[PDB]
Amino acid sequence: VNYLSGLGLSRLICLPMALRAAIELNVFEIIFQAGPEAQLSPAEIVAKIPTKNPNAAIALDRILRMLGASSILSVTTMKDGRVYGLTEESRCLVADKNGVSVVPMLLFTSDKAVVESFYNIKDVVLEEGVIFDRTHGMDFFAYAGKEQSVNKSFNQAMGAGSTIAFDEVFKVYKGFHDLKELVDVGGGIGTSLSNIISKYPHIKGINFELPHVIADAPNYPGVEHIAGNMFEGVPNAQNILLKWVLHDWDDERSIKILQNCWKALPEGGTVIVVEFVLPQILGNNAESFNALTPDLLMMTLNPGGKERTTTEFDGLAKAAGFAETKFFPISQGLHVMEFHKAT
């Protein structure tokens, strides 16, 4: 009945593009640097933006306006204009003391190559077996090996997410305690292993990745980088880490990965899986969005991939030869899961 304000549903595409602009203009760091609970005018923010455009503050106010009404920024309207401060939702856009924030992930997820592929997600409903591989011509990981800007943006997105995930993991999960050697299958640029190793310096880390990812991985002490193809085989390992890998693949390919892991482990070895877990009852909450967001990104980037429930992860482990599963909830849907090879 309210068609008039239903036209405002166009805000759903405006908001993420306004946010990307504000991130690229470094708005949130400028606000945070001004003081603990600073509220800055657009002109005060523009003072820290490298531009000599006199109309920059008027233009910036149009972007921050939308973010404030959307609760990404606080907006207080005063007589000379609006002033903007951080909110609980935008704190994560400011780097921590090690220089890590969600920004690399947010820029990747809204990058051109991803948003372009989003126009074809209805084809996964309409066309059996069709797959990015439409929109672009190869699979996402091959495309990354070919487009270095995408490789870098994705690798940095996953590295930032890795620091963020393991900072949460280490408050709850102590299973890395007794380990001596850990092979990270698809471990990205090695950030996960570096985080683990810095916490447990006795761990020998081996990062197992595609050549075009390894080529741009920095050298962390205690980490050796090995190139390979996890579908053909995984290096012999006392224990294996599998973080944000299984959710890239359908059941058949996930079982193949896990079976290769099983073959590389000795009796008693463990695969440590780190994923978000799809809740049984979905709703408007952090645990739901934390799984539904990567699930939709998978549908456009590697639709074989999908997020899974605890029951589905146990089913993958048992189908791959693992006898015992153990589930360790971390935070808001993030889980560590242990797949134990029998002793």
Which residues contact ligand SAH (rule: CB under 6 A)? 141, 158, 161-162, 186-188, 192, 209-210, 213, 228-231, 243-245, 248
Residue 115 binding partner per list a second copy, ligand SAH, none, with a CB distance cut-off of 5 to 8 Å that depends on partner kind: a second copy
Residue 215 binding partner per list ligand SAH, a second copy, none, with a CB distance cut-off of 5 to 8 Å that depends on partner kind: none
Residue 46 binds a second copy (CB under 8 A): yes
Flag whether 229 is marked binding: yes
Catalytic residue check, 247: yes
247-286 residues near a second copy, rule: CB under 8 A? 280-286
Flag whether 2 is marked binding: no
Flag whether 120 is marked binding: no
The answer to whether 113 touches 133, Cβ cutoff 8 Å, is: no
As a whole number of angstroms, the distance between CA 120 and CA 172 comes to 39
Beta-strand pair 223-227/270-276? unpaired
Residues linked to residue 242 through DSSP beta bridges, in sequence order: 273
Buried-state track 310-329, b at ≥16 Cβ within 10 A, e below 16 = bebbbbbbeebbbeebeebe
Residue 83 binds a second copy (CB under 8 A): no
C-alpha triplet 15, 18, 21: angle, nearest 5°: 150
Q: Least CB distance from residue 49 to ligand SAH, whole Å?
A: 31
In the complex with a second copy, the residue whose CB is nearer, 93 or 203, is 93
CA nearest to 149, candidates 111, 103, 201: 111
Residue 51 binding partner per list ligand SAH, a second copy, none, with a CB distance cut-off of 5 to 8 Å that depends on partner kind: a second copy
The answer to whether 241 touches 258, Cβ cutoff 8 Å, is: no
Residue 178 binds a second copy (CB under 8 A): no
A 10 A CB-CB count for 54 gives 8
Residue 295 binding partner per list a second copy, ligand SAH, none, with a CB distance cut-off of 5 to 8 Å that depends on partner kind: a second copy
DSSP 8-state assignment for residue 250: -
Q: Least CB distance from residue 192 to a second copy, whole Å?
A: 15
Residue 303 binds a second copy (CB under 8 A): yes
Phi, psi of 274 (to 5 degrees): -120, 115
Flag whether 230 is marked binding: yes
Residue 119 binds a second copy (CB under 8 A): yes
Flag whether 307 is marked binding: no
Residue 24 binds a second copy (CB under 8 A): yes
As a whole number of angstroms, the distance between CA 183 and CA 103 comes to 28
Residue 315 binds a second copy (CB under 8 A): no
As a whole number of angstroms, the distance between CA 81 and CA 61 comes to 9
C-alpha triplet 269, 270, 275: angle, nearest 5°: 165
In the complex with a second copy, the residue whose CB is nearer, 259 or 310, is 310
Q: Least CB distance from residue 60 to a second copy, whole Å?
A: 5
As a whole number of angstroms, the distance between CA 164 and CA 79 comes to 40
Residue 171 binds a second copy (CB under 8 A): no
In the complex with a second copy, the residue whose CB is nearer, 114 or 179, is 114
**Strand, helix or coil for residue 37:** coil
In the complex with a second copy, the residue whose CB is nearer, 69 or 342, is 69
- Among 177, 247, 335, 340, the active-site one is 247
Name the residue with the smallest CB distance to ligand SAH: 186
The answer to whether 70 touches 84, Cβ cutoff 8 Å, is: no
Residue 51 binds a second copy (CB under 8 A): yes
As a whole number of angstroms, the distance between CA 180 and CA 309 comes to 30
- Residues in the annotated binding site for S-adenosyl-L-homocysteine: 162, 209, 229-230, 243
Q: Which residues are catalytic?
A: 247
